[PDB]
Amino acid sequence: PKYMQIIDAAVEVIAENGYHQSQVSKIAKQAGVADGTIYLYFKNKEDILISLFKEKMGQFIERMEEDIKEKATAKEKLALVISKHFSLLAGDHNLAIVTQLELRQSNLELRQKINEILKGYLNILDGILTEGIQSGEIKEGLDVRLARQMIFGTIDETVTTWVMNDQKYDLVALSNSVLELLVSGIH
Amino acid sequence: RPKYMQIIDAAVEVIAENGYHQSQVSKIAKQAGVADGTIYLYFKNKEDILISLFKEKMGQFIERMEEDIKEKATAKEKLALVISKHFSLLAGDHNLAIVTQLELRQSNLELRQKINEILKGYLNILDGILTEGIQSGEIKEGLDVRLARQMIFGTIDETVTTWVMNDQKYDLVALSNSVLELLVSGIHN
Ligand SMILES: CCCCCCCCCCCC(=O)SCCNC(=O)CCNC(=O)[C@H](O)C(C)(C)COP(=O)(O)OP(=O)(O)OC[C@H]1O[C@@H](n2cnc3c(N)ncnc32)[C@H](O)[C@@H]1OP(=O)(O)O
Numbered sequence: 135p136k137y138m139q140i141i142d143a144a145v146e147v148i149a150e151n152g153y154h155q156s157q158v159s160k161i162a163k164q165a166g167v168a169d170g171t172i173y174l175y176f177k178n179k180e181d182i183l184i185s186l187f188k189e190k191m192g193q194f195i196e197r198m199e200e201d202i203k204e205k206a207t208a209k210e211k212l213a214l215v216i217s218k219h220f221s222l223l224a225g226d227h228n229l230a231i232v233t234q235l236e237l238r239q240s241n242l243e244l245r246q247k248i249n250e251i252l253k254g255y256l257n258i259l260d261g262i263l264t265e266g267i268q269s270g271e272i273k274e275g276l277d278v279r280l281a282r283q284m285i286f287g288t289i290d291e292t293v294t295t296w297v298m299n300d301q302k303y304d305l306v307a308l309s310n311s312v313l314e315l316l317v318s319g320i321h
Numbered sequence: 322r323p324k325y326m327q328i329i330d331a332a333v334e335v336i337a338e339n340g341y342h343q344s345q346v347s348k349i350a351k352q353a354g355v356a357d358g359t360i361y362l363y364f365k366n367k368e369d370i371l372i373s374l375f376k377e378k379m380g381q382f383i384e385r386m387e388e389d390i391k392e393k394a395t396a397k398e399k400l401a402l403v404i405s406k407h408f409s410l411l412a413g414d415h416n417l418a419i420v421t422q423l424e425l426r427q428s429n430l431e432l433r434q435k436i437n438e439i440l441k442g443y444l445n446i447l448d449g450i451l452t453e454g455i456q457s458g459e460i461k462e463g464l465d466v467r468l469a470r471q472m473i474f475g476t477i478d479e480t481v482t483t484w485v486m487n488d489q490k491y492d493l494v495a496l497s498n499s500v501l502e503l504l505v506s507g508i509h510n
Contacts, residue, residue, distance in 0.1 A: 151429065231430065235426070235428035280503060281503060284476040285508075287482075291474055308468065315507070319505045
């Protein structure tokens with residue numbers, strides 16, 4: 135709808151200056167819409183950011199929930215999550231910036247709302263790790279919470295370094311290397 | 322410089338308590354017990370306080386760790402000490418941890434370039450640990466240094482973040498060894 139049109143404009147505006155500096159005024163402009171229509175779909179500036187994450191990352195998470203079920207091993211499931219996460223971000227310069235730089239919010243209730251959306255992603259990781267242990271693919275005795283932190287932390291920092299380097303190298307081509315590092319470690 | 326450091330300390334406190342954007346020079350000045358003009362005698366602006374805060378703390382963090390890792394032989398041992406020192410510093414200072422994990426995470430891409438340039442000193446240590454390990458035959462052949470470093474930092478960093486998200490209520494430092502072992506051996510059986 136026009137709902138998606140403002141969401142898409144929001145991605146552009148927030149990426150340009152950062153969320154705090156971004157203005158609702160300029161979001162309407164890039165959307166090609168008037169200020170009042172923004173308040174027809176959204177409560178405020180904060181609601182736009184949450185909805186952005188819900189729509190962009192939330193839909194990614196749901197797709198992953200389905201698509202990993204096709205894959206036999208925990209390794210392969212993880213291979214797809216990383217690969218698809220890199221692809222999503224590499225297909226949109228502004229999306230990469232927003233998802234990385236605005237994931238960790240200072241304001242508590244805004245942070246809670248975004249964390250809640252990202253929990254679905256962490257849930258997937260925990261589920262891959264648990265099933266992996268039960269089948270014997272993954273280290274028995276593995277602290278699932280810690281391993282999920284490592285996996286997510288590694289994915290996130292790989293994307294963040296790329297964003298800091300103005301996305302000037304091929305993120306997607308790194309996914310298998312990232313997988314192997316997570317699977318085998320450095321020794 | 323004593324007044325310089327007192328301002329840094331006050332800034333950590335105020336920025337952690339109020340958030341960086343809701344933090345203002347005048348409130349940091351009040352917290353430090355100096356006049357507003359005294360802040361500017363040392364800093365360009367609020368932005369410069371945040372950058373210098375990071376530059377300062379990172380400097381002291383390395384100086385402890387850099388002299389300490391030299392005694393340790395293997396890459397694994399050096400990493401062990403990197404993780405525990407990283408965890409120890411942030412567990413010892415509640416407010417500093419909020420700053421590193423949240424308040425320094427500014428989305429103004431430009432400002433974030435100046436912050437990350439300070440991080441480079443630390444990431445370089447990780448790189449050196451890996452390349453020493455490569456040369457001695459300790460590290461897995463086929464490893465990419467840049468990516469492994471991103472793994473190591475991202476993993477340590479996410480562990481601190483999750484801890485901060487949970488109000489720093491559990492013993493972060495005690496997870497050091499397990500995080501090390503995950504990074505060294507991976508998730509596989
Ligand atoms: C006080 C308490 C302490 C405790 C620790 C402190 C924690 C508090 C930190 C809070 C601030 C954060 O947000 S930290 C959490 C999020 N993470 C980050 O912000 C860090 C992300 N990384 C970066 O910012 C950047 O990598 C820098 C600026 C830090 C490092 O830049 P650099 O020195 O150029 O190194 P690097 O990025 O490797 O770039 C070198 C060249 O290699 C390329 N390159 C980089 N990675 C890769 C790769 N995986 N595969 C291929 N190529 C790559 C780059 O494009 C670049 O191209 P060319 O153009 O050079 O050819």
